[PDB]
Amino acid sequence: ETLVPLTKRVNVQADTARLDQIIDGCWVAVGTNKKHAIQRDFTRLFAGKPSYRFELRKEDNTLEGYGKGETKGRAEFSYCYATSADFKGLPADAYRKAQITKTVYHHGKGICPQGVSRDYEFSVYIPSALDSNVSTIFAQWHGMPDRTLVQTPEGEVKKLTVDEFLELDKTTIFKKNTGHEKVAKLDKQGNPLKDKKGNPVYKAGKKNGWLVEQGGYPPLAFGFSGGWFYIKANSDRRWLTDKTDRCNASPEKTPVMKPVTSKYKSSTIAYKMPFADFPKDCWVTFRVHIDWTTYGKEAENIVKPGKLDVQMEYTDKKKTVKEHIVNNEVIQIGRNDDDGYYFKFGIYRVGNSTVPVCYNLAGYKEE
Ligand SMILES: O=C(O)C1=C[C@H](O)[C@@H](O)[C@H](O[C@H]2[C@H](OS(=O)(=O)O)[C@@H](NS(=O)(=O)O)[C@@H](O)O[C@@H]2COS(=O)(=O)O)O1
Numbered sequence: 001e002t003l004v005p006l007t008k009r010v011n012v013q014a015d016t017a018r019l020d021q022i023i024d025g026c027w028v029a030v031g032t033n034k035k036h037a038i039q040r041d042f043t044r045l046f047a048g049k050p051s052y053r054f055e056l057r058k059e060d061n062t063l064e065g066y067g068k069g070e071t072k073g074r075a076e077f078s079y080c081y082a083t084s085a086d087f088k089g090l091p092a093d094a095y096r097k098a099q100i101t102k103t104v105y106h107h108g109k110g111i112c113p114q115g116v117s118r119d120y121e122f123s124v125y126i127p128s129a130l131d132s133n134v135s136t137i138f139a140q141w142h143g144m145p146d147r148t149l150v151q152t153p154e155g156e157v158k159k160l161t162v163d164e165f166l167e168l169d170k171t172t173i174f175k176k177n178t179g180h181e182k183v184a185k186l187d188k189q190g191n192p193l194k195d196k197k198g199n200p201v202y203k204a205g206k207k208n209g210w211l212v213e214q215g216g217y218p219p220l221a222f223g224f225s226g227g228w229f230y231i232k233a234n235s236d237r238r239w240l241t242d243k244t245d246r247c248n249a250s251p252e253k254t255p256v257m258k259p260v261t262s263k264y265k266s267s268t269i270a271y272k273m274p275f276a277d278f279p280k281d282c283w284v285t286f287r288v289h290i291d292w293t294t295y296g297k298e299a300e301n302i303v304k305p306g307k308l309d310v311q312m313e314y315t316d317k318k319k320t321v322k323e324h325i326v327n328n329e330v331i332q333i334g335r336n337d338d339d340g341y342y343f344k345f346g347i348y349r350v351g352n353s354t355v356p357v358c359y360n361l362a363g364y365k366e367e
């Protein structure tokens with residue numbers, strides 16, 4: 001039993017993790033639950049401990065991307081999640097409301113707050129077999145949208161109470177950020193569906209003009225794209241993220257430390273290297289220090305810029321290498337939200353790609 005499937009999955013925004021879903025006391029898994037997607041690997045040890053092998057085959061995109069007809073794939077670990085214990089002391093109804101607002105993980109461990117520096121470390125192991133045209137994020141620092149921040153059909157941006165948001169949710173259903181008239185789904189015969197609880201199955205009707213804050217680019221991502229290893233930092237100072245503003249730097253095209261900018265956003269390639277030069281069949285360790293950009297909430301200003309420092313270490317061809325690949329660079333990095341940031345690693349296959357991805361991750365620590 002050299003590879004042990006870890007198939008349990010948590011919707012961290014909408015559900016607590018049961019203790020039996022927690023991996024090694026500090027992780028939950030998200031994305032496709034195929035046996036091969038995530039496995040504890042006793043054949044590829046790091047620091048005398050099992051690593052995690054991640055694998056998405058061609059057919060393993062189970063999610064939709066932003067554009068029409070686009071798909072994406074996910075098999076990742078999240079360091080942030082809530083448990084039953086996190087709701088100890090709160091009113092009984094707190095959890096139900098957290099599920100609807102998608103704020104359950106707000107109550108959990110693993111959040112680095114707004115404007116709080118933190119250090120991180122992790123290691124990655126890229127097999128020789130990894131295709132050079134993969135399109136995958138293997139480690140990311142993810143933001144936490146304001147879940148009752150909405151835009152009306154008429155175009156007013158406003159944050160509601162939870163109770164008021166629950167009222168809106170009676171007639172609106174949000175698919176990602178986009179509001180639709182809430183309706184009940186029918187079977188192929190035109191008869192109403194009933195769920196396991198005997199309730200109607202709610203469905204998105206036509207768009208109704210409402211928006212809610214949801215998704216957005218990760219403040220920091222490590223990945224491969226177009227034959228490049230890259231580190232990409234994103235910033236968004238708009239109180240309500242505008243998802244139509246596709247401000248994003250290309251590893252291929254964008255030169256290093258030259259931000260692609262919009263009115264509110266910034267996307268910087270902090271570092272890149274040709275895929276061919278990335279060490280294969282060895283552990284590559286990243287030490288990351290982040291000073292988050294700080295924002296003025298409803299004022300939508302950048303208060304202070306951020307900073308990024310990255311060291312990369314490995315052993316290959318009978319020499320140890322240490323390179324200061326991001327050398328204390330002033331950078332814009334973060335999001336204008338109430339809550340801060342959480343780490344994930346694994347596979348997030350983006351850029352409308354189905355090129356297979358398989359590699360190992362281990363040795364995670366934060367401050
Ligand atoms: O659609 C884009 O602009 C885009 C292009 C990049 O090739 C891809 O890495 C990037 O993926 C986003 C993702 O968009 S997607 O269309 O859903 O895949 C985005 N989702 S969204 O719902 O907020 O738009 C989020 O998950 O971040 C992905 C990675 O972002 S970045 O690391 O490229 O900045 O989007």
Ligand SMILES: [Ca+2]
Nearest residue numbers: 239240336337
């Ligand atoms: Ca926001």
